[PDB]
Curated annotation (Swiss-Prot), chain D:
Superkingdom in the source lineage: Eukaryota
Additional facts recorded: The postsynaptic actions of L-glutamate are mediated by a variety of receptors that are named according to their selective agonists. This receptor binds AMPA (quisqualate) > L-glutamate > kainate.
Function statement: Ionotropic glutamate receptor that functions as a ligand-gated cation channel, gated by L-glutamate and glutamatergic agonists such as alpha-amino-3-hydroxy-5-methyl-4-isoxazolepropionic acid (AMPA), quisqualic acid, and kainic acid. L-glutamate acts as an excitatory neurotransmitter at many synapses in the central nervous system and plays an important role in fast excitatory synaptic transmission.
Residues of the full protein shown: 644 to 692 of 883
Domain-related comment: The M4 transmembrane segment mediates tetramerization and is required for cell surface expression.
Gene encoding the protein: Gria2
Phylogenetic lineage: Eukaryota, Metazoa, Chordata, Craniata, Vertebrata
Modified residues (Phosphoserine): S40
Protein name: Glutamate receptor 2
Subcellular location: Cell membrane; Postsynaptic cell membrane; Postsynaptic density membrane
Length: 34, 50, 50, 49, 50, 50
């Protein structure tokens, strides 16, 4: 059935970066990037 | 699944599967750079010495 | 400063477990956006627009 | 100075192609290119098609 | 098997299989070269400014 | 004359009938050669050296 897929990655600019307001964020929204 | 700046190599293929590459690239060399400002009035008297 | 040319040809692609179920359809989607050209647009979004 | 090293470019890019009629341009049939443009969504590419 | 400079697209994947792409490229625009232009009267003032 | 930049990104690959068995091992050998880089020297042969 519909389940959550585990997506792995690495902190890379500009691939994966942390938002300025990630502290007040939750889950996947805590991230930003290509 | 992995969605990240991951280099695809044969040995990595030998253990898991990969899609078609989306961004082609190559090895590059990074160094420091000298930044010489283009002078103004001094561009005139440049050649010899003051 | 980036100096010198490229050394070889290798790119980035999505990684899936050997025998993963989605890999095919995922690769299909990659081909879609590739034919949808949004890829290099995003490349400008995270590389060139700033 | 004083050299014939000019090598003028009559065309800049596809952008120049979309805005002129002097020079025609086409492609090869039974090829991917025609499909790419026929399915292209870029404005300039659309006008070129 | 097809061992040839074949372009790879979605619909082509939709019918057959392709290995990992080995040589990357883009669409190219070809024209006739003009002859090396001669400046003429402009050489009187051409350099050093507009 | 080649003018302007490339329009997009796409490359060549070996094509096989969808569902054939040889495709996997062929892909493997292709990757091996790509890491072996001999394909580059061949590119120099049929593009540059002549």
């Amino acid at each position: 059935e519909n389940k959550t897929v585990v997506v792995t990655t690495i902190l890379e600019s500009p691939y994966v970066m942390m938002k300025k307001n990630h502290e007040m964020l939750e889950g996947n929204e805590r991230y930003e990037g290509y | 699944i992995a969605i990240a700046p991951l280099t695809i190599t044969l040995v990595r293929e030998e253990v898991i599967d990969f899609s078609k590459p989306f961004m082609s690239l190559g090895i590059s060399i990074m160094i420091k750079k000298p930044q010489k400002s283009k002078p103004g009035v001094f561009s005139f008297l440049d050649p010899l010495a003051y | 400063m980036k100096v010198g040319g490229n050394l070889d040809s290798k790119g980035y692609g999505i990684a899936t477990p050997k025998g993963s179920s989605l890999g095919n359809a995922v690769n299909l989607a990659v081909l879609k956006l590739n034919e949808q050209g949004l890829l290099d647009k995003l490349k400008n979004k995270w590389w060139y627009d700033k | 100075f004083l050299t014939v090293e000019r090598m003028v470019s009559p065309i800049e890019s596809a952008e120049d192609l979309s805005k002129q009629t002097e020079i025609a341009y086409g492609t090869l049939d039974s090829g991917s290119t025609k499909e790419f443009f026929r399915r292209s969504k870029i404005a300039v590419f659309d006008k070129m098609w």
